[PDB]
């Protein structure tokens, strides 16, 4: 049942925000959902795997998300941005790669809610990680040069 898989993955994605270690048991079943016909389920599975995964899996999973960014709705793009925010908290050493990805998404087409969620994520990374501050402020300065909002 697609609805039951969706409900389970969405709930696991919320658990993975608070208790990522508990969800790690489900990682094998979540990997099978990465190729689901429902792109919403696949996106929730990847974003859950990002929250629960190892630092070594980040570059592989980020590369898979970048291929789905064109096929997913803006609501699911916001869920991807929230997963990146949680990744920056968990793996502060990867902030430069994650900020460059967020900055690339900021240059692409997107609605107000999606652009807001990216800006909010960059601001959160700047507040939590002082080493990211100058780079994040520089990316926000480039964004305001062509900001429609």
């Amino acid at each position: 049942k697609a609805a039951l898989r969706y409900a389970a993955v969405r709930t696991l994605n919320k658990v993975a925000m608070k208790h990522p270690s508990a969800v790690t048991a489900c990682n094998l079943d979540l990997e099978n959902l990465v190729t689901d016909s429902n792109r919403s389920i696949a996106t929730l599975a990847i974003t859950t795997l990002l929250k629960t995964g190892s630092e070594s899996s980040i570059d592989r999973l980020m590369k898979q998300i970048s291929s789905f960014m064109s096929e997913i709705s803006d609501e699911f793009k916001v869920v991807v941005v929230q997963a990146i925010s949680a990744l920056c908290q968990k793996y502060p050493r990867k902030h430069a790669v994650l900020m460059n990805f967020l900055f690339t998404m900021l240059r692409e087409e997107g609605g107000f809610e999606y652009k807001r969620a990216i800006v909010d994520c960059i601001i959160s990374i700047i507040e939590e990680n002082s080493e990211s501050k100058e780079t994040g402020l520089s990316h926000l300065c480039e964004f305001i040069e062509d900001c429609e909002f």
Partner: peptide
């Protein structure tokens, strides 16, 4: 150095 800008202002101008 050639870039296509896809800002909300450029979309609204193109739609106008």
């Amino acid at each position: 150095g050639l870039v296509q800008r896809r800002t909300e202002a450029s979309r609204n101008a193109a739609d106008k």
